[PDB]
Design a protein around this nucleic acid. Structure first.
Lengths: 159, 426, 100, 171
DNA sequence: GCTTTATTGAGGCTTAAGCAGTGGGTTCCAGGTACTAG
DNA sequence: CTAGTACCTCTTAAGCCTCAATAAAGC
């Protein structure tokens, strides 16, 4: 059974295997980093297709939609819905902001899922954060939690 | 009274003796006769055997009530099919149930009940039961009795006792035969659930509400709420498909979701509709259906041929059936409508031997003038077995002359094709 | 064919019943004004060869202690005539109905 | 839930397609499988990254058949909901039993019995909506709800949630 | 000093094994007995 | 009366238990 009490499944272990057999620590990402990696993958796919063939909430959405249509477009309609869901209510628009956020979250050293939730979900009070994740109650100090929450709130982009 | 019949060690002593199964009755009779003979002969000295019995359900064993084992061994000595050595003492507490009559598997007969006759295998209805509980009146289907046919055929043995009572060959009422037979001869919302019993057996869905033992669930197959008794639902841990159905004289559809009594079918016009089992007149056999169409390129297309649409999505698939103006094609790469779509033939592109059984003579070959029997023709060549040689040779039929079954004149391959196929006159 | 009496359970051929009837219940049948055949049934289960009914516990269990030695049926299907039942207040059917 | 991991996929290729472009063709078949995939074991596959860095292992030839089986290992980001998490979505449709909320590639349903007492369905507006003493819910609204149950389909994932704790609902 | 021990071994009985392939000609629809339908 | 229908009927290789002796521990 999977729940919020860190009772992950047989495959969602704290350690992950690499293509070379090396064991690494599980790494998570937030919505902004997910969008960044998706955009990088789309750019790489577009470049691959081009080389193979050779031999403010109003304009970015259109560019993303046309890019999706050009490459990996029409195979499934769920990709467009997921892209719209990610783009409509995103938080960070700059790579520097997400980089700083992930660098700060690295110092905490908490579970990847917990830090991902903290960087994605929005909280304003200690009690709300504690009740949101009862498992992560006696793990993070109240002062540290408040500091990270206010830092994340300040780092929020003004759209 | 039965409370005073409880067996005791000092009063009841029965020993079980193994015997060849099935011979229980004959063995019991033989032992009883032997005991009577011994009593008549010996006189005062009589073996202490009180009773000898057996149980039908317990084959291969008999029971003898005697005070001592030695008496039983002496009495049974020399009796074939009885293993005196293989014997055991019956405990007192087990004596009652041994003599307790077995509960007959036949349910208590009641008027109007349905039973099976052991008209073997024909359902019957119990109409009346005799006061002695030895014979029962059963109503059965004789097809229903037809007074018209009986009158037409065997009016001599047919009699009319009432407006709906007819006697034939010694009693038919309302088209059914009444005959006497011996009795011995006769959950929480969101939970995944599945129907195990009822009209909707096999349906699966997600529960939404439970009240007074009735569970309502939304079914994926029908996309509607169905309310069923809780006892008929089981919590599950989280015509066939593609058949051709003749909806009417001019309507043919292909099934995309084969259910128990509900079938979803796409018609020749591409419209998908849900119908009942009764709406299907009959099933069209694709293999036996000799229907062919012409594609855009003019190449003939038959059932099972792989075709690709020239316009649209260029769907590739195998043709299941051919309609007068449409063709149904099933594709393994399409999940929508079970991969079955109806397309126009013009919008797709594909990816009687008279000689047989008649004696013949060859004309221009190494076996000319030799009688032969035609077996089969592969097209432009006829296979013939020679009477004097145990070999089959393929030779062009045009250079062979046909003869009558019994002698007759020789005719080349110019009269049978022109004139009606008939053997010459001897 | 062999039939077993529904009153005492004695099993005998139909010819014997037609000729002499039940040796142990002829008087009761005559008093009840019923034929032997109506008081006998052809369906029975199990065979019991009773040799000493007075000294045999099986006879007491089958209520044939006062009967004579011979062949008897443990279970007999059917019902006796109402007249016979009226003359036997303590009659117990041998079909297993009263063996609960 | 937005996890990057290595996935190994076995792809069968006919020996006829053996030219230099086969790689690209293989990649195309990879793009037609990972995209839109939804398996209960690995959850829903979101995206595959590092297209140019994809490494393909040496193909495996069947003992008798001429097909080549290539085992390609690739790093991909996938999404999988878990019980007790809270996610935000957009109402897609309204019904008497509740309103479905599209979140990512998945759908969420809220049980009527687990709704605020003040919140009440109303059909007086076109389309029907819900009215609350201090909140307004319509088709076009961002609603944050907690997921309490997950259901896995052949090619879909469904969630069952409720809104009882504070700070939930319209935001 | 005597008695009762765990151990050693030695055979009877038992249950298993029993070249590869292939061509053909014969025989079974089993016997009696009782119960029951036309 | 007559005929269905079923129900009864030669040469070895291992395991194990069963026998006859033998040195030590109790007492």
């Amino acid at each position: 059974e999977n729940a919020a009490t860190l009772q992950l499944g047989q495959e969602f272990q704290l350690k992950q295997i690499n293509h070379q057999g090396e064991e690494e620590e599980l790494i998570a990402l937030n919505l902004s980093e997910a969008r960044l990696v998706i955009k990088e993958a789309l750019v790489e796919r577009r470049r691959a297709f081009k080389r193979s063939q050779k031999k403010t909430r109003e304009k970015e959405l259109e560019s993303i939609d046309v890019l999706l249509e050009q490459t990996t477009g029409g195979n499934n309609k769920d990709l467009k819905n997921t892209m719209q869901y990610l783009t409509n209510f995103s938080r960070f628009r700059d790579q520097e902001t997400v980089g700083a956020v992930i660098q700060l979250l690295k110092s905490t050293g908490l579970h990847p899922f917990e830090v991902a939730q903290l960087g994605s979900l929005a909280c304003d009070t200690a009690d709300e954060a504690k009740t949101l994740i009862p498992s992560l109650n006696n793990k993070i100090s109240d002062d540290e939690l408040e500091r990270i929450l206010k830092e994340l709130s300040n780092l929020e982009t003004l759209y | 009274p039965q409370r005073f019949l409880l067996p005791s060690v000092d009063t009841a002593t029965i020993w079980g003796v193994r015997c060849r199964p099935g011979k229980e009755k004959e063995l019991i009779r033989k032992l009883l006769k032997k005991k009577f003979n011994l009593d008549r002969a010996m006189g005062k000295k009589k073996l202490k055997i009180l009773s000898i019995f057996q149980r039908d359900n317990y084959t291969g064993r008999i029971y003898i009530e005697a005070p001592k084992q030695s008496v039983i061994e002496k009495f049974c000595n020399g009796v074939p099919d009885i293993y005196i050595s293989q014997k055991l003492l019956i405990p007192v507490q087990e004596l009652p149930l041994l003599l307790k009559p077995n509960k007959s598997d036949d349910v208590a007969l009641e008027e109007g009940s349905y039973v099976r006759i052991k008209y073997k295998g024909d359902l019957a209805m119990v109409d009346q039961i005799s006061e002695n509980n030895l014979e029962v009146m059963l109503k059965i289907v004789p097809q229903l009795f037809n007074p018209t046919m009986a009158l037409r055929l065997d009016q001599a043995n047919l009699y009319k006792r009432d407006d709906r009572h007819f006697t034939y060959k010694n009693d038919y009422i309302d088209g059914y035969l009444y005959k006497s037979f011996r009795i011995q001869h006769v959950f929480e919302p969101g939970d995944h659930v599945t129907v195990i019993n009822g009209e909707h057996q096999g349906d699966a869905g997600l529960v939404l509400m439970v009240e007074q033992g009735q569970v309502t669930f939304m079914s994926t197959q029908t996309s509607r709420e169905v309310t069923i008794t809780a006892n008929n639902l089981s919590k599950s841990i989280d015509y066939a498909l593609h058949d051709i159905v003749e909806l009417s004289a001019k309507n043919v559809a292909c099934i995309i979701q084969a259910g128990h009594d509900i079938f979803k079918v796409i018609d020749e016009t591409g419209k998908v509709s849900t119908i009942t089992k009764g709406s299907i007149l009959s099933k069209i056999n694709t293999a036996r259906a000799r229907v062919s169409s012409v594609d855009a390129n003019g190449n003939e297309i038959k059932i099972g041929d792989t075709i690709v649409e020239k316009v649209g999505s260029r769907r590739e698939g195998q043709v299941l059936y051919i309609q007068t103006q449409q063709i149904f094609v099933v594709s393994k790469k399409i999940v929508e409508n079970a991969g079955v779509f109806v397309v126009n033939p013009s919008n797709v592109e594909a990816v009687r031997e008279v000689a047989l059984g008649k004696t013949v003579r060859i004309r221009s070959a190494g076996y000319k003038g030799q009688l032969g029997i035609v077996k089969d023709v592969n097209g432009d060549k006829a296979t013939v077995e020679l009477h004097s040689k145990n070999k089959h040779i393929t030779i062009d039929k045009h250079k062979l002359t046909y003869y009558n079954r019994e002698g007759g004149e020789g005719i080349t391959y110019d009269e049978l094709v022109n004139r009606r196929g008939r053997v010459p006159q001897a | 064919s062999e039939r077993a009496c529904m009153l005492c359970g004695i099993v005998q051929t139909t010819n014997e019943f037609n000729r002499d009837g039940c040796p142990n219940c002829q008087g009761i049948f005559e008093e009840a004004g019923v034929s032997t055949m109506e008081c006998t049934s052809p369906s029975f289960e199990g065979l019991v060869g009773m040799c000493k009914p007075t000294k045999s516990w099986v006879a007491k269990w089958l209520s044939v202690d006062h009967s004579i030695a011979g062949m008897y049926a443990i279970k007999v299907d059917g019902r006796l005539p109402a007249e016979v039942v009226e003359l036997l207040p303590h009659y117990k059917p041998r079909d297993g109905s009263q063996v609960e | 839930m937005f996890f990057i991991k290595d996935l190994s996929l076995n792809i069968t290729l006919h020996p006829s397609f053996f030219g230099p472009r086969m790689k690209q063709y293989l990649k195309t078949k990879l793009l037609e499988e990972v995209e839109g995939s939804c398996t209960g074991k690995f959850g829903y596959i979101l995206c595959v990254l590092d297209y140019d860095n994809i490494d393909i292992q040496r193909g495996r030839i069947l003992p008798t058949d001429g097909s080549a089986e290539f085992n390609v290992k690739y790093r991909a980001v996938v999404f999988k909901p878990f019980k007790g998490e809270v996610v935000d979505g957009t109402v897609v449709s309204c019904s008497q039993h509740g309103f479905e909320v599209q979140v990512g590639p998945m759908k969420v349903f809220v049980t009527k019995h687990l709704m605020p007492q003040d919140l009440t369905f109303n059909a007086g507006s076109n389309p029907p909506s819900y009215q609350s003493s201090e909140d307004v819910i319509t088709i076009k609204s961002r609603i944050r709800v907690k997921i309490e149950g997950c259901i896995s389909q052949v090619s879909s994932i469904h969630a069952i949630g409720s809104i009882k704790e504070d700070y939930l609902g319209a935001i």
